[PDB]
Structures are given as C-alpha cells and as structure tokens.
C-alpha cells in the first residue's frame, strides 16, 4: 500500500519515521514499586 | 613580538625548585595550539572529542638531569598556581635520562560527549602545567637555558564533525597568476 | 481489533478498584469496567496522530526577516540597511512550538528548513526583479558575514542555498546537538562563578542562518520578506513537563512578565455551577 | 574579557540608553544584555559586539553583559542611575 | 513496618512505606555503551551510600513550600561533598526520603515532587537571571513564603517558580504526605541527563520541592506548626577527573 | 562496535610506552590507557566527515566575473566593454579552497561546475530581460572567442552550456590533468632555462571558461554577474603537506607579501600563564 | 626504564627502580580472622590510590635530614586526607618513592628508611613528651637541622632522635640514593600495628627519614643543593567508622 | 653499532641508527602497470648505488639551517651525475644520512626533514620566480642565513621558504638530531612524484632541510661551532632516454 | 536504506564516492624501519 525510497546518503534527509509501537505509559502512571523486595541494584 | 623559531623553545632553568615550566589552557583551537597541524585541522570543524597526545623532548646536554611533573588539570578547577595543586589531577613524573621525550596523553574528560573547536566556558576542556619535580642540574663547563620541545597530536579515539571555515588565511580580493 | 471495553456485569468484589491512595503517586488503570456495567467496544485507533512524531511535527514558521534589494554604494553598515540579515537559529520565538517542545525535558530532532521568499516593491518601480536569495547556514560559533558582499558568503565550507525570490528551498540538518539531546530546560550555569548567565545554554546551538540578495541593484528598491519554516522529524522526547501557563518573556529563560493575568478562568458562580 | 559600555551612565527617568556589550572572543556563541528593561538589539554586523537601545530606564538598574568567552571575566555589569 | 539500612544509617518506618521510583528506572552505574568520559569512575563506599538528614523546616497554615537542588544540598554532607568538590564529573541517583509526622486530629497534604531540570524563573522579568548563589542554596533550600530578593528566583508557588501551574505538577514523580494517611514519602530518584555525567557544582540534575496543597489545620489549641524534615542517600553515585578542590561561590 | 578505550587498572610496567624518542620521528601510538587507569568506552564514530572526499567536497565560488547585455555596434575591443569575458579554470583565487587543497601536494579529482548567473539593470529599465548565457568549456590552450559574436562560440567540439539568467547550469568535467594527479606543488620548471618560471606549471591546467549573453541588445543595458561553483568529487590526495601560515599573493606560487603580520599569537602573559 | 600507573598518576624512571618491600610483605587489605571492629571498611578507589608529591627539600652541604611521619603527611593531601579526617579507624600502606637526581660529578649518600613506631625522643631529657604538633607536622616534616623547639623532639642524627646509633638503622627497611648509582628510592611499605586497624590521627604507623650519610660534594663552581622530592601513594587503604570531621589542633 | 655497505662505500654507526622510510614505501623501481616511457631503462650498478658524502656545512649559535635539493646535490657526482646528465629521463630513491657528533656537554636538536615538491617562496612578493641558479645549487645547497639575492628564494626558516610554519614540519618525513641522544639520522626517501619517471634536471623530487630547533649550545671555552655533514647514496635509480649530455645554466 | 541508479555513461557524472573504510595512519605516524632487518629490496 506504500513505498519509499532512499534517495540520499544521510538519515537525516529521511522522512519522519512514523509511529513508535510499544507505547506504555506504566513509567508514568504506575512508578511505585515496593522497595521491600529489593529491586534496587 | 615575531615568530621566531625561539617561539618552539620551553626554556629549562637550572636550581628551580617547586617551580612551574609552563602552562597553557586546552583550547586546542586556539592560543599555542592555533597553528599547529591538530589546531589548523580542528579549526575547519566545528565540534571535537577524544584524547590528545602530548610530548616533551629534552634536548639538553647529556650529562644533565632533570625529574618534571606533567600535570593535566581537568576542568572545573583553576589552571594550578603550585606543584601541589597541579599533582592532584592527572600527572605524569618524567625523569630525564637515555629516553628524552615523556609522552602524556590528555584523556577524554568530559561530561558532554563533544566539546567546540572555539573557545568556550561550558565546553572547556582544562589546563596543561608542566613543573619541576627535583630541579634541573647541568654538568660543569655548562651554564645558560636548556630547553623543551613540546608536541602535540591526536589519539587514535579523535572525532571530529561539524565543518566550517577556517579563520587562519583571509583574503579581500581574488588572486591571479 | 483492540479491546476498548470488556463486557462486565453485576460486581460484589471485595478487591475494591476504586479506592485507592494518591499518596503514592500512581495512577492505577481504573477502567470504565470497574465502576459500571460496561458492553464489549473495540478501539477501531491507533493514536498516530499522538505520536511525538506527530505532535511536534509539522512545518512552522520559526523567523522572518525582510531583506532588500539596493545601490549599496556609500553604506557602511550594511546590516543596518537590512542588506543582509543573520539570524542564531531557534525554536524559541514562536510560542506555539515553544510550549509544545517545552512540554519535554529533552528532545532530540533532525531539521527540516522550508525558506519562503517574498518579493514587494513599495516604492515606484517599472517591473519586478528576478531576484536571487542567498540563505547560509552558519554552523555554531562561525563568523557571519559582516557586509553584503563579504568574502564570508563565498565559504568553500558554510552550506549555502541558492533560490529565487517567490520560490522556496528545502534542506536538511542532522541534530547537531554536543550532548544526547536538546535541552529545553537547564538548570545550571556554563562554569561555577557568581554572575554568570542562567539556563541560557551553549548546549541547544543549532546553528545560524545569513540571508541577502544575490543580485546587483536595480534602479528601485526592492523589499524581500524571508520566512524560515522548521520541520522537526525524527523526534525522541523524554520527562514529560507541566505545560507552560504564562507568557513567556525571552528566549531560554522561563521568566514571565509581572503582573500577568490569572491563568485559571474564575467561574460564574460558586462551585456547585455547571 | 566581556565588557560593556558605558560602565556607567546617568540618564532621565523613562529615557533610552544604548548599551554596548562586546567581547575579546572574535568569534562569542553567547553574547548578550541581562535587563529586565525592554530593549532593542541594533542592527550591527559582527559575532563579537552587540548594542542595545534599553528603552524606558524607571529605575537605578544593573544590566549585565554576558557571553561564554572563557578569556576573563565573562560577565561585565554597567550601572544606570535616575534623575527626576 | 519497613526498614532501609544504608551504610552506618537506617530509617525505619512504620507506615507501609511504597517508594516511587522516577520513570520505574532504578539508579544504575553508566554503561560502557553510554560513557563518553574514559577515565576509570570512583565508585564510593559506605562512606557516600548513606542517609543524610537536612535540617528540618516548620510548616505552619501560612507557608508557601520549599524546594531543594540535588546534588547542590548535599554539598556539605560528609564524604559525597568533597568527593564532589575534589572530582570534575558526578553522577548519582537519590533515595529521598521526606518525613511529616502529626496526629489523627491534623489535616494538610503535602506535594512532594522531583523535577528534572527545574529551570527557575527570575521575579524580575525580562531575560534577567537567577544569581548562583539562590540556585545552589546548600542544606537550606529555597523557602517560597520569604520575600524575593536581587538575583534570586520567583516565589509564587501556584506557578512552579518557572511558570507552570502547580496543578500539573502531577506530572512529574511525587508523593503525596496526607497527614490523615501517611507520615512519610519516598521517590528513588535515577540520574537524569542528556550527557552520561555532568559537572556536580554548576548543574543541578533534579529540584525536590515539598508544597503544601492542603493547608495545615491543627487542631484547637494547638502548636500552629509542623516540622518537615528531609533524608536523602546518594544512590549508584560515581565520580571522575579527580584534581585540586573546586571553588564555588558561597 | 569499535572500541575506543580499554578497561585498564594499575599498571607496574617496564616496557614504559610513555617514554620514547621522537628523534626517530615516528609518532608510537600512546593511548589514555597506557598512562591514567581506564574505563572502556565506544567510538560510536566512523569519521565520515574527515575523510578526503568530505573534506574537499562541497561547492565552493571559484571565480565570479561581470558581462554586460548592450548594443555592441561600434565597439572594438569587446572583451574591455564586457560584452563577453574568460576565465582560466584554477581552484587557487579563492583562499579557502587553496588553503584545503593544498594541505597536500598532489590531488586527482573530478570537476562538477555549478554556474550561477543573476541580471541587475541599474541604469533605467522598463523590465527585466529574459536573458540566455552561454558558458564555453575551452580545452586548455583552445582559442577563446576574441569578439562576442566570434565564430569561436559556435565551436563544434568545444563543449557549451546554455541556460536562462536567474537559474543555473550543472556539469562534470572528468580529471583533464596529463598526469596521473594534478601538482598543487611543483618544485621545478618547463625545461632547463635560466630564465624561465618557477612553480607555475603547465601540468595544472584544467581548462578556460568562456561567458556571454547570447541575446541581442534591448534598449536597456542588463548586467549579468556570473558565479562559478565547483565541487570536486572521487577526490585522491597524497602526501600530507604543513598548512599555509601566510597570505598568499599569485596563483600558482607560494610566495607571501612582505612585511607580513605575525601568525603565532602572542601570549597576554609569560609562558605560564593559562 | 620503569612505569608505576596508579589511579591518575605515573611515575616514570629511566633507572632499573628495584623497590624494596618491608619485610617481604605486600600491602593487604585485612583478612575476616583478623578484624575484630564489626563495620564494612570502606576501601577508597582510584580517588585515594595515587601519588601524592610533598614539597620539595632542599639537600645543601650540612643538612641532617628530613623525617616525615605517615599517615601524617598525607593528612591534606585530596581525598585521602578527608577519609582519614571523617573516619574513626584506618589502616594503610604506602608505596615510597623519594627522587634526587644529580650529574655523574656529583657525590653524596642518601640513606631513605622506614621506621615502624618511630618514637621520638625529647631534646628537654627527663620524662618531657614531644607535643603533638611536632610529631604531627604535616606534608613539610621534620628537619633535623633546624634548632629545638620547646615540645619538640631531639634533632641529632647521630642518635635517630631516638638513642639509638645512625649506622644501625639498617636493619630497618631502607634504601640508599647514592648519586653516583640511583637517583630514586623506593620503599613499599604495609601497614605494621598490634592492632588490626587503629586510629589514623592519634598515631602514626611508621617514620620516613632520609639521611645524608656521604654528604653531598657539588662539583667546583655548582650551586651547593640538591632538590629532594617524596612522592607518596597509599595501598590497600582501609577506612571504618565514618562520623563527624574530626578536630585535631593543627 | 649498524654498518650499511652499498657498492664500495660503507657507513659505520656506533649509534642504533634507526631509519625513517617516507611512508613506509621503500624505493622501488617503476613497475610494468605504472609505466609509460616504453624504453628499457638502465639500472646501474654499483657504480651509482653509493654514498656520496657532501661538503661539510658549519653549525654555528646563530645558524638558521640548510637545503638541499635532490637530485640536484647528486648532479656533479661521479658515475650517478654523468648518467643524470646524459639521460633524458629519471627516478630514483634516496638514502640520506645526516652526520653530526658532539660531546656529552654539548645542547642542540637538528630537525632533519624531506620535502617533497618543496616549491620555494620568493622574497620579493608578488609573483616573482626563483630562479633556475638558486634551486639548483648543487651540492652546497642553500645556506638559510645567509643574505636575499635577486632572484633567490625568501630564506626566513620560522615559514620554511614556502609560507607554511616550521613547527608544522613533522607531517613529512624527519628525524632529529638531538645532541644529547644521537649524532645521526638516516631518511630512506622513494621516488615521489606524480608522473612515474620525469626529468631529472628540470624538476627536484624532494628537499633535504637541516634545520637546527634547539640551538647549538656549547660548553664554556668551547669552539661554538659543529660540523654537519650529509652523505646519500640512489637507490633503485632508472635512466631512460639516453642522448647527447644535457646543458643547463651553471 | 539507500539506492543509486547511474543515469550517465561516464565515471565523472557519478556522484561522490563516501568513505575510503580501510584508513591507517601509521604510513604516516609509525614510518620507522630497522635497515638491519634487510627490508629494503
């Protein structure tokens, strides 16, 4: 349904890549962690 | 005043004690370093990282002796205004025998990963001081300056990104044959 | 197909979901499920248009300066007589995209420049001008140029584009940043001293753009209004921010004006209005 | 170093100054007046010398020329009196 | 109850103590795919990992909150202080642990929160900025209910002291310290930069700042007062470039 | 991944690398790791930008020269009234380049040639012309056109370019040296003479431009102002060369001006000042 | 030629530097069988292992000697200095290196000793002790030259400002910079007590004295001195009982 | 020691002579792939592949250095001169060895360096030529402090005749000659040159520069001068085009 | 992630080569040979 190709050398002159799948918001929303059972290095 | 080949000349004085030889900022494109290879080459890029290589060659008599402190001060502090300040960084004590040249390499220390050509306050890299470690002492039938012949190269870790123009050669007009 | 909402029904649950302690800072998942009897709906989204990529996304207009096209002949500042314009590249002086790249911490892009020139001829004039514009990206800390026809312009170095007046030009630039990221916030100073600048940084130099008409005067002036559109692509964004509420005041700096108005619209009655 | 002129100057209540903020850096990436005054950057070409029109001076203020140029003092404050 | 024993030191706590760990990210050493800096990192002892208490503040009905800039409040605190005034680069996580105790016949709710790079507003507007002094205040901390002073940062709280609403604070990683509830808040704090590791004296990684957003009501007859106090342990703490001690103003 | 230091710890070596003799002139290859204890870190670094081909390859103003679109009815030399003017091909009037070119002693590249040409009318014009310029690649030593009309422009084998002022023309020239690299040093002269040059050799010469405007004359005088822009490309450079210091004076020489300025900047100090 | 790299600091010799280690026994960290205090020791990294270089003495015709106590003379000397002043309890080794260099016309003897519980006696006879301010004096130490203080020790070479006589000192680890032969010396020195690990302020573990013995003869029209340069780098250096800075006077 | 015997000529060195070879390429003779020129060429024998020692240059305090330019210092000796003359074409590698001894009390650093196209400046400025007399000296090359002639090349050693600064002279190949280690220095230089064989006569290949760095210093009482003498011997040498002799102008 | 047709007959209408990978400096920086090892042909 799409094609692209690259018609320069550097990355920068790439379109925008587009999505980022694996969004998770638990970084945000749910940090709490009991430090009880010793998750810290 | 001129540029002199005297210009290349770290002059060595004998019965020095705790004394400095010399010391210079790490701007490596500017000041002492403008118009060496690394600093002409530097000077047409924008960003740099990586380590240098830094030597001293003596080239006073044979029959002399000399133990120096080559202090590398990382940034944050002052440039070192006595021994004891300069031996708490990075430093090397070079006794001058058979093997003439020290070679000391300045590490890579920094925070950010890349540091600019041009001199500036966040991205400065520290400061070079080289002192006398016992003394320098000449044999007998000798007087006067000895000297040091300092080099500077880049470590096989150097980068270097951004181009720019060079600010050494300028020109007003266009050149004919 | 992903699950928006699951069929629930009559709940007698001991392991009560909805209460909870905000004290601990979390936002536990509570789902529409938990609260009320829900039926099965599908999503039928994606959310791309949420993407940071998105988001920050799109070609905005970040300067504008006007040019002109004169004799130049007994002029000794140039720039003064808008023979030429520089401008220290930054996505600071439009609000718009400053409050939404400030809703990040850090942020990584490459730059994507759009240069719309203008041509206008105010003053009598018997046609208009085939000009050509010189825009010069000038990276961080090189000089710029000092005079209409310095020998700055000619750098066998400095990117320069060439393009008509009423034309526009497209190019490129990788993130040029020294660390891993853009620092839209920075609380700190260059070096330890008393009175040394605050969160102005050296650290978010994306470079500068040199603007002038290529062309020798004509007989009348004319006046070129260059706009500079930035695209960011390739985003990465980390440390969500609380978004910005007052005016700003000046570039790098969060300060705003004293005496600014209150944010928080004030209601129209008591607290029990709807 | 970082300088600013003039060092000091003595101008009416509500009145306009210009400030010059230059630098011994030829080539400065930071160069610029710290003021909660409205000011104007003058047209000028150059990377190492800036001059402000400080415009509608109400009070004794102590605007700061600032760079990143590591020679010196990187920072030079010139001081504005009232008179009304 | 709960126990965290770090060193020669030891909170103990008997409130069920969750902890908040910034972005569900523990303080980690830099990674040799990471650093940049190629000199062989100080990793401290006991003599660092350990808690350190700061002088408590008094909360009373009337005051405004108070904020604190890592590493900078830790700057006088035994070994970790002159291991940061010796060495040209530092990075460190945080275990901040802010304790409030009263009785059941007490209400007020504080906002304790860590923000990254809390670029602080100058009260005077303009581009002026905040003097060094007032952004590296030590110990003491900044207190929002004094009066501003020449170089020093804004204190209106409802607006962050940069211009964002206290509201939205949320965003950032907090506990709340709701008096009727829990005595204590922990946020384990990573290291947070766009460069692996930093300068310790000149930049201040992260802002703690402990707000009240439901004011303080003792009950009748009561001292109209409660002493906050703050504990903090460095975490995964590393330092490199050692050379002469630092001189920072004040 | 390439590595760029190595974990080192205490080190109680007697096959010291830190001392050496550089009387030998080579420089030993001293790493961090063999003078301070290390960490191992990463290059992430490929050098792209520093390579020869970067290092020398961007298009660069080579030469600019003025032509004028007029009635040529009673003029003898057309050359001085600008009706056409040529141009030696060499990379050495402009300062930057030469100065990057010649931090080697021999280069082989190829020439891509961007030529750019924009019309002013000063005097009083009732519009702008729709111009068409000729630029004429001359083989080295190929006769150039003596009048602006000359037959010499309708060359059957001389290569030539047509293309609008305002916009621009494009094209390779391959390497035309006749040895294997072009001398932007040569210590040596044509042949054994006494008399003869110094330096400026034959063997560097990369052909002649040739411009007019091929349009007859309209009422008004139109001057066009032709930039030449050249980028070498599959660029080879041998032998590392030290660095110009001084001005340069000719093409082709590497003499200096007298009474120049010093170039080692002098200390605002004694030598141990920082 | 030889090369010692520790931490940050190298010293490089281009004599064949033989060292001479106390008793055949490296610097080690103290073993589970015998410690006794319970604490985790703090083991400093790079940060404190390093050479640290003490001021210069000058070496004239009729100098007695210089005497330096450890850990004393390192008291100030970076982050080694403040570990010893913020921790109750320390033990440590030390890897010597004193340095003269002179020309083949030159002549003189350098005898540079280590003396484990080198207990100085007073000038004043009797039962008078040396106060602390003298057998504690920091990086300069003592020279035997100069004249008696009140408090202070006896400066007779001859006798070790001990009773005992000069040329028996060889029976404690040593090494001689003969200037016809050497040029440095270097002594490796592990940590000798009764107790496994003690109190670095209160007492000093050992005694660094460099004696003329030959005196030194400058060739005819030379300056009349030499430069001596201690260089000093702590090894398996052990840290317990981190508190408050402790207060010594001087 | 080292002894390096080409043809009846032999140099013997007490000294560990090490020799620099220009980019690690040795002198080689033109292969098949790289040849234009299609005469067989002649390659001498022993008759060419020697050392000829030129006359003795005088270092003095005040001396600024020498040039030699090759072939042209060859160009009067022996059967290698005849061949360069007689022969339309040529190519050959160099063996140069730089002699100059002192004693254990004498200071100084030679910077023995080869230029490749060494394209002299003149002192006039503009676009004036160095003449065909000056760049061929021959075998007493040309002195760097003696005075300007018309027509002679700038002779300012600080910008190395050419407008590029002497420091930066270490990007060619060179060796020094530092009084205090060696008293040689051997340079082995290949064919350079952009054509694969060319006129011997009309073009020097490279530049022998003898440039003191360190200035000579010595003893009290001493004669203040020392001799340096150059010998080099063709190696791989090719003739091609055998004719009547060629004339050049002096 | 990057394409090149070669619209032109000619080496010279191609466009820039990119990187030369093999670079080694000790041409250069380690010039120096023992002439007792009978490395000269």
Request: charge should be neutral; charged fraction near 15%; proline fraction near 7%.
């Amino acid at each position: 349904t799409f094609t692209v190709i690259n018609y320069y050398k550097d990355a920068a002159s790439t379109s925008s890549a587009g999505q980022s799948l694996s969004m998770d918001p638990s970084k945000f929303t749910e940090p709490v962690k009991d430090l009880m059972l010793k998750g810290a290095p | 005043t001129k540029d002199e080949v005297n210009s290349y000349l770290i002059p060595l004085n004998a019965n020095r004690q705790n004394e400095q030889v010399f010391g210079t900022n790490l701007f490596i494109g500017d000041g002492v370093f403008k118009t060496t290879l690394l600093g002409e080459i530097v000077q047409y890029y924008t960003h740099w990282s990586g380590s240098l290589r830094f030597s001293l060659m003596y080239t006073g008599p044979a029959l002399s002796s000399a133990k120096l402190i080559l202090a590398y001060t990382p940034p944050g502090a002052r440039g070192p205004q006595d021994r004891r300040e300069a031996m708490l960084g990075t430093h090397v004590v070079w006794d001058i025998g058979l093997q003439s040249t020290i070679v000391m390499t300045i590490p890579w220390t920094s925070g950010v990963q890349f540091r600019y050509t041009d001199p500036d306050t966040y991205t400065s890299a520290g400061f070079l001081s080289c002192w006398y470690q016992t003394s320098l002492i000449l044999p007998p039938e000798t007087t006067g300056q000895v000297y040091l012949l300092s080099f500077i190269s880049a470590c096989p870790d150097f980068k270097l990104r951004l181009m720019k123009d060079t600010q050494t050669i300028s020109q007003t007009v266009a050149l004919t044959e | 197909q992903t699950v928006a909402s699951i069929s629930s029904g009559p709940k007698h649950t001991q392991k009560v979901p909805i209460l909870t302690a905000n004290e601990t800072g979390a936002t536990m998942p509570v789902l529409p499920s938990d609260s009320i009897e829900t039926r099965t709906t599908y999503m039928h989204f994606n959310g791309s248009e949420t993407d940071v990529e998105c988001f920050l996304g799109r070609a905005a207009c970040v300067h504008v300066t006007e040019i002109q096209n004169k004799d130049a002949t007994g002029i000794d500042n140039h720039r003064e007589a808008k023979l030429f314009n520089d401008w220290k590249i930054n996505l600071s002086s439009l609000v718009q995209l400053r409050k939404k790249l400030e809703l990040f911490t850090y942020v990584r892009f490459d730059s994507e420049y759009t240069i719309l020139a203008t041509a206008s001829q105010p003053d009598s004039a018997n046609y208009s001008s085939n000009l050509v514009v010189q825009a010069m990206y000038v990276p961080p800390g090189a000089p710029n140029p000092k005079e209409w026809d310095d020998y700055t312009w000619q750098s066998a170095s400095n990117p320069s584009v060439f393009f008509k007046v009423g034309d526009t030009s497209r190019f490129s630039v990788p993130y040029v940043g020294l660390a891993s990221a853009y620092n839209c916030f920075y609380d700190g100073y260059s070096h330890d001293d008393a009175e040394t600048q605050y969160g102005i940084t050296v650290l978010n130099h994306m470079g500068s753009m040199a603007f002038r008409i290529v062309n020798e005067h004509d007989e009348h002036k004319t006046l070129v209004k260059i706009r500079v559109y930035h695209r960011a692509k390739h985003v990465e964004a980390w440390i969500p921010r609380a978004p910005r509420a007052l005016p700003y005041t000046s570039i790098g700096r969060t300060n705003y004006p004293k005496n600014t108005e209150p944010v928080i619209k004030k209601r129209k009655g008591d607290i029990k209005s709807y | 170093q970082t300088s600013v002129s003039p060092s000091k100057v003595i101008l009416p209540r509500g009145g306009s100054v210009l400030v010059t903020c230059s630098t011994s850096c030829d080539q400065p990436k930071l160069l610029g007046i710290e003021t909660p005054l409205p000011k104007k950057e003058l047209l000028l070409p150059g990377n190492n010398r800036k001059v402000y029109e400080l415009s509608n001076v109400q009070e004794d203020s102590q605007p700061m020329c600032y760079s990143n140029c590591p020679d010196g003092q990187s920072t030079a404050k010139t001081f504005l009196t009232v008179y009304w | 109850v709960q126990q965290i024993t770090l060193g020669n030191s030891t909170i103990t706590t008997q409130e069920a103590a969750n902890a908040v760990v910034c972005y569900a990210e523990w303080p980690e050493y830099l990674p040799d795919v990471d650093a940049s800096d190629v000199n062989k990192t100080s990793k401290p002892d006991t003599s660092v990992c350990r808690f350190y208490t700061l002088d408590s503040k008094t909360w009373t009905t009337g005051s405004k909150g108070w904020c604190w800039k890592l590493p900078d409040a830790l700057k006088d605190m035994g070994v970790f202080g002159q291991n940061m005034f010796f060495h040209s680069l530092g990075r460190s996580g945080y275990t901040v642990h802010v304790q409030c105790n009263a009785t059941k016949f007490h209400s007020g709710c504080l906002l304790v929160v860590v923000i990254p790079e809390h670029q602080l507003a100058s009260h005077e507007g303009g581009n002026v900025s905040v003097k060094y002094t007032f952004t590296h205040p030590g110990e003491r901390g900044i207190d929002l209910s004094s009066a501003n002073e020449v170089g020093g940062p804004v204190k209106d709280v409802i607006y962050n002291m940069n211009g964002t609403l206290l509201g939205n604070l949320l965003i950032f990683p907090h506990q709340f310290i709701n008096l009727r509830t829990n005595n204590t808040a922990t946020i384990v704090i990573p290291y947070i930069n766009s460069v692996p590791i930093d300068s310790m004296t000149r930049h201040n990684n992260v802002s703690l700042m402990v707000i009240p957003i439901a004011p303080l009501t003792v009950p009748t007859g009561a001292t109209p007062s409660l002493p906050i106090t703050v504990t903090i342990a460095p975490m995964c703490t590393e330092f490199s470039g050692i050379r002469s001690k630092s001189i920072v103003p004040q």
